[PDB]
C-alpha cells in the first residue's frame, strides 16, 4: 500500500516511503490555510501523528485514502 488508491492496482502502487497507509491524512490543514484546495494536503504519515481535538489527522491503514470529500448519503 502507498498513495491513493480508490480500490485499485493502477492507483495503490508505490508512492510514498516506507509506513502504514503512507501519505497522512490530515483535514483542513490546521485552522491556517485559505488556500481551498478540496481536502486534506496529504504528503506521508507512516505513523498517522500529531492529530488534534477537531481532528487534524488521521490514520487510514490502507493507502493515502484522502477520499475525505463526500455530503450526504451515498
Not at 502504514?20 to 507512516?46: H, I, P, Q, T
Amino acid at each position: 500500500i502507498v498513495c491513493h488508491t480508490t480500490a485499485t492496482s493502477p492507483i495503490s502502487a508505490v508512492t510514498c516511503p516506507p509506513g502504514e497507509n503512507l501519505c497522512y491524512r490530515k483535514m483542513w490543514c490546521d485552522a491556517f490555510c485559505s488556500s481551498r484546495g478540496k481536502v486534506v494536503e496529504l504528503g506521508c504519515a507512516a505513523t498517522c501523528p500529531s492529530k488534534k481535538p477537531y481532528e487534524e489527522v488521521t490514520c487510514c491503514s490502507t493507502d493515502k485514502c484522502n477520499p475525505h470529500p463526500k455530503q450526504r448519503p451515498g
